[PDB]
Amino acid sequence: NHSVLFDKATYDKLLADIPKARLITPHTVCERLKVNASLARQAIRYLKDQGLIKIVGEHHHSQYIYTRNTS
Amino acid sequence: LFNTRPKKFGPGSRQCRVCFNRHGMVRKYGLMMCRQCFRERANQIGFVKYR
Amino acid sequence: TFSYRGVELDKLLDMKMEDLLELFRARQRRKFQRGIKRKATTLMKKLRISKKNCAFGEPEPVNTHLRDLVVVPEMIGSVVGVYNGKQFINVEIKPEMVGYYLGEFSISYKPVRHG
Amino acid sequence: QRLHRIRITLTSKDLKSIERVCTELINGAKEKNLQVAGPVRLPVKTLRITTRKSPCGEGTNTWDRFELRIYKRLIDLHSPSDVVKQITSINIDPGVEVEVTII
Amino acid sequence: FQHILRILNTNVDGREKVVVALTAIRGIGRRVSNLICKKADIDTNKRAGELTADEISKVVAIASTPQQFKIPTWFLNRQKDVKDGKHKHVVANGLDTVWREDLERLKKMRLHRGLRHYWGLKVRGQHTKTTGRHG
Amino acid sequence: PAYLYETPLETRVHTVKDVKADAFIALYANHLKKRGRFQLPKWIDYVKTAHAKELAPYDPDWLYIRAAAILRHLYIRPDCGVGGFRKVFSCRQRRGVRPNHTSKASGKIIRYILQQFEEMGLVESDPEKPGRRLTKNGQRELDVIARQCAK
Amino acid sequence: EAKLFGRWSYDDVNVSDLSLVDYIAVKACVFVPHTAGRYQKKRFRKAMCPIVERLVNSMMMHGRNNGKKTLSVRIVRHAFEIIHLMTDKNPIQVFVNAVENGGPREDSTRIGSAGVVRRQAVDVSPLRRVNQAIYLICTGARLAAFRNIKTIAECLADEIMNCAKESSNAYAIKKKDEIERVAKANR
RNA sequence: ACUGAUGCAUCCAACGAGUCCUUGGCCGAUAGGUCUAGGUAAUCUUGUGAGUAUGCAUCGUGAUGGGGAUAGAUUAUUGCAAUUAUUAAUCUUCAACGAGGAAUGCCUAGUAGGCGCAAGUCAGCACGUUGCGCCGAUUACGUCCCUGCCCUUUGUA
Numbered sequence: 017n018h019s020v021l022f023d024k025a026t027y028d029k030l031l032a033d034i035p036k037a038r039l040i041t042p043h044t045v046c047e048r049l050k051v052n053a054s055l056a057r058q059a060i061r062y063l064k065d066q067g068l069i070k071i072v073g074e075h076h077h078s079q080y081i082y083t084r085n086t087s
Numbered sequence: 088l089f090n091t092r093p094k095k096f097g098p099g100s101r102q103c104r105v106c107f108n109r110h111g112m113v114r115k116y117g118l119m120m121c122r123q124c125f126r127e128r129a130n131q132i133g134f135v136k137y138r
Numbered sequence: 139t140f141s142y143r144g145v146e147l148d149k150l151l152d153m154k155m156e157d158l159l160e161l162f163r164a165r166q167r168r169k170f171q172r173g174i175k176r177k178a179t180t181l182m183k184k185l186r187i188s189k190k191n192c193a194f195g196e197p198e199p200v201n202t203h204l205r206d207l208v209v210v211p212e213m214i215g216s217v218v219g220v221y222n223g224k225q226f227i228n229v230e231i232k233p234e235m236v237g238y239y240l241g242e243f244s245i246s247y248k249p250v251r252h253g
Numbered sequence: 254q255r256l257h258r259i260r261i262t263l264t265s266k267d268l269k270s271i272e273r274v275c276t277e278l279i280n281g282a283k284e285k286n287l288q289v290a291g292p293v294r295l296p297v298k299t300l301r302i303t304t305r306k307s308p309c310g311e312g313t314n315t316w317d318r319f320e321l322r323i324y325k326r327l328i329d330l331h332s333p334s335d336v337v338k339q340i341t342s343i344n345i346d347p348g349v350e351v352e353v354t355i356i
Numbered sequence: 357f358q359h360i361l362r363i364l365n366t367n368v369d370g371r372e373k374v375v376v377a378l379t380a381i382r383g384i385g386r387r388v389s390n391l392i393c394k395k396a397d398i399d400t401n402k403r404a405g406e407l408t409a410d411e412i413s414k415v416v417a418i419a420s421t422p423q424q425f426k427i428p429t430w431f432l433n434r435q436k437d438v439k440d441g442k443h444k445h446v447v448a449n450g451l452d453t454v455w456r457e458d459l460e461r462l463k464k465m466r467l468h469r470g471l472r473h474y475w476g477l478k479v480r481g482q483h484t485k486t487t488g489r490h491g
Numbered sequence: 492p493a494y495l496y497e498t499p500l501e502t503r504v505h506t507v508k509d510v511k512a513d514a515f516i517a518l519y520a521n522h523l524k525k526r527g528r529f530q531l532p533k534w535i536d537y538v539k540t541a542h543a544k545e546l547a548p549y550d551p552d553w554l555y556i557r558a559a560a561i562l563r564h565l566y567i568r569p570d571c572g573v574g575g576f577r578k579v580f581s582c583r584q585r586r587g588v589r590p591n592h593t594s595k596a597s598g599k600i601i602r603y604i605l606q607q608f609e610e611m612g613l614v615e616s617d618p619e620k621p622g623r624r625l626t627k628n629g630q631r632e633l634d635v636i637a638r639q640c641a642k
Numbered sequence: 643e644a645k646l647f648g649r650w651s652y653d654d655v656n657v658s659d660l661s662l663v664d665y666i667a668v669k670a671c672v673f674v675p676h677t678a679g680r681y682q683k684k685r686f687r688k689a690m691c692p693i694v695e696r697l698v699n700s701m702m703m704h705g706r707n708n709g710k711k712t713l714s715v716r717i718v719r720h721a722f723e724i725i726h727l728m729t730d731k732n733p734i735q736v737f738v739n740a741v742e743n744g745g746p747r748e749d750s751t752r753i754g755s756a757g758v759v760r761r762q763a764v765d766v767s768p769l770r771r772v773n774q775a776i777y778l779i780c781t782g783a784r785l786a787a788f789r790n791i792k793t794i795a796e797c798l799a800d801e802i803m804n805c806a807k808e809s810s811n812a813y814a815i816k817k818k819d820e821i822e823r824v825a826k827a828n829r
Numbered sequence: 830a831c832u833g834a835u836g837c838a839u840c841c842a843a844c845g846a847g848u849c850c851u852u853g854g855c856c857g858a859u860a861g862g863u864c865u866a867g868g869u870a871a872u873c874u875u876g877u878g879a880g881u882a883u884g885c886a887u888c889g890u891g892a893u894g895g896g897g898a899u900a901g902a903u904u905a906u907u908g909c910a911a912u913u914a915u916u917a918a919u920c921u922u923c924a925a926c927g928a929g930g931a932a933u934g935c936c937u938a939g940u941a942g943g944c945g946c947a948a949g950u951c952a953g954c955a956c957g958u959u960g961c962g963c964c965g966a967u968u969a970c971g972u973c974c975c976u977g978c979c980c981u982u983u984g985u986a
Contacts, residue, residue: 451922
């Protein structure tokens with residue numbers, strides 16, 4: 017069902033798209049988007065390093081669970 | 088020539104001293120006792136069952 | 139043409155069996171190093187001299203019990219009557235058959251046909 | 254004579270057979286008043302066989318749980334070997350394997 | 357971007373990672389496909405939908421002749437060929453034709469093992485009273 | 492609500508046991524590259540690390556982290572050898588349709604890394620005494636980088 | 643003191659409604675849901691445990707997932723974090739209000755007056771309504787994420803919030819009204 | 830299958846059992862081999878660094894990397910002999926099966942279930958049995974409805 021590459025049309029949107037949402041998970045990326053969970057991990061890892069968003073808890077190795085930054 | 092294979096190992100090698108039976112051979116601690124033979128004489132050896 | 143391996147059938151008889159074993163699977167080598175005594179060693183004579191007895195034009199059936207003997211490119215083009223269980227059956231061993239055991243070729247039992 | 258060290262092994266099937274020997278040989282040492290330490294009780298090596306009760310397969314598959322028990326116990330001494338031979342040779346017990354050892 | 361693919365006369369799929377995409381080729385699997393990817397210098401992070409012309413050309417050379425790139429022989433499928441007598445790697449529809457040769461060899465030879473293929477029973481000596489029943 | 496609790500005093504950073512064992516290996520693996528000494532095998536393309544494992548390791552620095560882990564493990568238990576280190580990196584093999592069992596680790600790769608530490612001379616025999624042990628220079632190599640990682 | 647995971651305080655908050663009160667075990671309380679202790683010798687030691695312990699305890703199913711309490715601690719520790727994320731207040735007050743509304747009110751027992759297997763209307767006890775609540779919470783969350791690539795923690799967090807709510811999307815709040823469908827008729 | 834599979838790292842058991850059990854050093858991807866070496870055993874193997882577990886990564890709901898049957902080819906091991914393949918490895922080959930129809934079994938606290946280990950038969954072979962620990966729940970504390978049982982009064986050809 018799902019798209020595997022970035023899709024560089026939606027990369028310009030994806031800067032705007034994810035910081036709107038209240039829940040930020042593996043699932044909420046492919047909720048808004050229609051791509052496999054794997055991109056979502058490297059997306060929210062990219063949005064840690066470059067972008068805004070922050071960890072709810074320091075970390076875990078299975079369920080990530082970020083918030084919007086609120087700034 | 089006749090009347091001997093290599094008879095060194097396996098159940099054909101060895102038999103119960105008391106009844107000459109290979110089957111059910113208890114070889115723990117070097118008993119060489121067929122089980123039918125072993126259970127009835129077990130008290131006389133030393134073995135007393137509890138729990 | 140089309141002997142058995144990269145080494146052709148002209149050369150193989152010439153090649154020594156001892157160094158020959160290197161070009162073998164896994165059990166033939168194990169069997170050969172352990173091997174052989176008794177009445178396999180008589181068939182190395184007996185199946186060899188079975189070739190000369192016929193006048194020409196390419197044999198006569200030498201009966202055996204040894205299913206466990208592995209065939210060897212010394213003795214190819216011979217014949218071996220291998221034991222099933224009651225009856226002997228004829229096996230003209232070929233250039234292709236080297237590697238395998240004798241009692242693989244002669245079956246023990248009839249396959250099926252229920253009802 | 255010379256300063257020696259002796260540590261005598263005791264083994265049997267019964268508890269009651271050794272508890273004679275442990276009480277007797279320490280009092281036998283205390284005739285001469287040698288340097289005795291008390292009897293060091295090692296862990297019990299329980300042997301085990303489980304056979305089926307029935308001769309043949311019939312009925313429910315029931316099992317015996319047979320057991321031996323073996324009791325290693327060690328009387329310690331510091332004394333020469335000529336002295337100890339009087340103590341051990343008198344008061345030998347029925348069916349108790351005993352072996353004297355220097356060091 | 358390229359959806360769908362074909363390497364060595366067998367259809368490799370996109371939407372799959374490059375190591376696992378190569379197992380869709382017959383006569384390739386998981387551990388050897390890593391050695392193909394490592395010695396072709398392909399990034400395993402990349403996706404099999406991409407694959408540039410440099411990447412596929414190296415894989416066909418390694419799949420044809422893996423003895424050249426120091427794969428030490430126990431990795432190969434048909435190890436010692438039993439015809440020309442060398443360490444050989446069988447890939448794709450070669451493996452179909454090799455299986456047709458090796459079974460029909462044993463039918464002409466008339467082994468017990470060959471007759472099991474001829475009748476289509478279990479070969480390896482398994483208790484077929486109850487098991488492998490339905491057919 | 493932030494996380495509660497400490498120990499009574501702020502914990503001393505001196506020896507290697509005070510360092511968390513995974514975070515030690517993260518540093519000292521990178522130390523093996525940047526120093527240069529240790530040296531590569533030929534076989535690195537193959538392996539997988541065990542008879543039991545059905546696949547090769549993903550990370551290309553699987554050898555350095557293993558040589559990092561084994562060197563600190565000499566400090567935990569002083570006396571050990573090759574059959575010892577086969578047990579410590581044991582794992583669940585999957586037999587097939589059958590139930591699961593234990594299995595021992597690879598003996599080539601675990602022996603080789605010790606011989607490379609012997610060439611520098613951090614871990615050594617012990618020719619008469621059964622089992623390898625770390626030397627004086629082995630400890631100061633460990634304990635200097637224990638203070639660095641927490642810092 | 644006493645806080646769950648150290649990020650929450652047992653102190654404060656309150657039971658939602660009369661009944662199912664005192665049956666619940668809050669008030670004092672233990673950081674970490676887990677406790678290995680003897681709770682099954684008497685027949686009302688079962689409502690001495692705090693219900694967060696009874697959630698993690700009953701969250702292990704079926705044969706494959708049983709045991710591994712340490713694993714069920716993690717996914718509940720994530721679930722209480724997500725509950726906090728939406729409609730933030732207290733994970734426990736939302737969880738206590740969920741298990742209030744979760745379990746069924748009435749039930750059909752078989753009393754025939756000899757011969758027949760005939761149904762009859764019977765109200766449910768306060769203990770069983772807590773027993774059924776935590777069971778029905780989980781079996782929604784497990785079934786929701788069984789084939790879907792959604793973490794169980796996500797299902798649990800979602801299931802708990804829904805139960806507090808009257809959405810009825812939940813498996814639990816449906817299976818309340820599915821029993822109360824037939825329990826109305828058996829009057 | 831995602832409370833998961835896979836690759837790395839972390840660190841914890843008890844019952845045994847040996848005149849065969851196996852540490853230590855070299856060779857080998859692996860299995861295994863080779864040269865020394867302790868042990869009649871609370872001393873040596875062994876504190877048997879067991880696996881569910883924990884931490885950090887990749888995979889993404891696809892019968893897919895879940896599943897490992899079926900099948901070819903090779904390398905060692907036990908034996909006097911392994912073919913109808915004794916096993917153990919290395920590469921491939923990649924089916925059925927998406928929680929199981931009617932029927933029906935086992936079980937009340939360190940118990941169920943899961944996860945290993947050891948012993949018995951044994952030259953070699955456990956998917957079996959007998960013991961051993963580890964992780965550790967849900968739900969009853971009642972009843973005679975089903976299926977049987979025990980004791981009375983009662984009827985019987």
